[PDB]
Amino acid sequence: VDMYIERAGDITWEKDAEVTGNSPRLDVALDESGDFSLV
Amino acid sequence: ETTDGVYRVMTRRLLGSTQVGVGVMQEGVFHTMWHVTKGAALRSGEGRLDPYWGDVKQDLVSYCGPWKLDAAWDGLSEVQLLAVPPGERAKNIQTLPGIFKTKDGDIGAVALDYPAGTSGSPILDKCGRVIGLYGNGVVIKNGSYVSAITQGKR
Numbered sequence: 565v566d567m568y569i570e571r572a573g574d575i576t577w578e579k580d581a582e583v584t585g586n587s588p589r590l591d592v593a594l595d596e597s598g599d600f601s602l603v
Numbered sequence: 604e605t606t607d608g609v610y611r612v613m614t615r616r617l618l619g620s621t622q623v624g625v626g627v628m629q630e631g632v633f634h635t636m637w638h639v640t641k642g643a644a645l646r647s648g649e650g651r652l653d654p655y656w657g658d659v660k661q662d663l664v665s666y667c668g669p670w671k672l673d674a675a676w677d678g679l680s681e682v683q684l685l686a687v688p689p690g691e692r693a694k695n696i697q698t699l700p701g702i703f704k705t706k707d708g709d710i711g712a713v714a715l716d717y718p719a720g721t722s723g724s725p726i727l728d729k730c731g732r733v734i735g736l737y738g739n740g741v742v743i744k745n746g747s748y749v750s751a752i753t754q755g756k757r
């Protein structure tokens with residue numbers, strides 16, 4: 565009813581994409597409501 | 604339109620047109636995160652997509668069929684977030700996943716920060732396969748955001 569979708573592109577790997585972001589290892593828990601929290 | 608690809612999830616119930624999330628159409632099934640639609644039916648043009656499966660704890664939901672995406676991070680190689688941010692064009696962001704360590708096992712995580720309306724954007728491996736959805740995560744001691752690589756079961 566109230567929500568609709570519209571296409572935004574193909575699902576493809578991009579050969580010349582930018583590389584960024586860290587790779588942290590984090591102790592987390594997942595509760596019954598689907599929220600992660602930091603341990 | 605059941606055309607494969609990545610989609611914005613929009614609503615007109617607030618001010619103007621507002622993007623609440625993103626999802627993946629594959630094999631006639633639309634895949635997104637539960638907190639985006641809250642399991643509500645969706646429109647695709649004149650047609651209707653009814654929910655089929657979902658799970659609040661996984662924070663995933665599928666429409667028109669069961670979950671189809673079964674590729675998984677290999678634990679070693681870099682991936683690409685295909686970020687679809689509100690009002691901005693889709694762009695691939697390559698990164699090396701970190702790791703959420705949980706009592707039930709480890710899963711990959713991407714430390715990339717985007718508006719909440721980017722929830723549901725797919726994460727891809729080098730072969731172009733969707734290895735999970737972006738948008739369920741935590742906030743680190745630095746104040747930055749880290750999302751799990753949330754994948755369903757097929």
Ligand SMILES: N=C(N)N[C@H](CCCCNC(=O)[C@H](CCCCN)NC(=O)[C@H](CCCCN)NC(=O)Cc1ccccc1)C(=O)O
Pocket residue numbers: 597598599600601602638662716717718719720721722737738739740741742746747748750
């Ligand atoms: N740096 C940031 N927050 N980036 C985020 C990026 C959002 C993209 C992901 N999509 C969401 O908007 C999801 C939606 C909620 C799903 C629950 N199943 N938010 C999150 O993943 C986290 C959950 C933290 C749970 C801690 N127990 N909440 C915040 O970050 C909300 C928050 C905001 C500020 C302080 C503390 C929490 C943002 O710009 O909102």
